[PDB]
Amino acid sequence: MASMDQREILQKFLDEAQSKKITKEEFANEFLKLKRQSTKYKADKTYPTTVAEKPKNIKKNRYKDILPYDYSRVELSLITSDEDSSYINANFIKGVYGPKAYIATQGPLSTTLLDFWRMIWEYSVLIIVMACMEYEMGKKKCERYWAEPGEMQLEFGPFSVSCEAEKRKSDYIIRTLKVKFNSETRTIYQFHYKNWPDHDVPSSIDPILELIWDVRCYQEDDSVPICIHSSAGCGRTGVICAIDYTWMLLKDGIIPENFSVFSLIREMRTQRPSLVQTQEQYELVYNAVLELFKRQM
């Protein structure tokens, strides 16, 4: 009944932050609860992945253990090939004000480059954020779906992608793409993040903040979904949403008196599986959110 002001709520958060950064295995135990909730959701078959488990879709899933929930999967309606199904390993992640703020998805496969672009198109996606390298752990983790300077135009079904510009920056690149489809030409902005903040090194978290701030300089609102992907579309994909989300609350003076990263992630994992893969990412989210709050003083 007696509401407290934003700042004060940040101070409550900051005050705690101190002891928590100490509380033994606090983060470990915290994250261990996330896995638990998932295990219970899978035991009760609460969130079906039937569509993604159909035979014809197996070739469209990069990892067998990462399957999009049915009720929150991005359905592909745009038909261009007598062989275009509706499936795609991706989910809608709700935003601070409503559904479809994000499209957490995997790195497209050679066999899903078409479906990828259908999606981006059908939902007028303006921003695409790639949070990974094409090559990691000695192997390929994402297929080429964008176009690079002086490289003409790659073709996926009826889509034409050419790279008009490519503003390289500190830790990421901004490819200004032009996609053609049935006489229509749209501009998509891809934010390729090759590096990843250093778990315990507070200084290394700044680059990731720069990205979202940059990303948000291109699309302040939530009119259209923001596509965010990694190899699997769970871990790093999940770190970006949460921080952007939290940041969105902070940018509008609406951080719930009882805000917590654990709860924000808990809720996100109900929309997309394995969102925020490990303890390290969990902690990164927490540390990054903390840095933001400190910056509000």
């Binding site: 990069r62 990892y63 067998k64 871990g235």
Partner: peptide
Amino acid sequence: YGEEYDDLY
């Protein structure tokens, strides 16, 4: 390709 994103990677 399908090979556990969790199983290490």
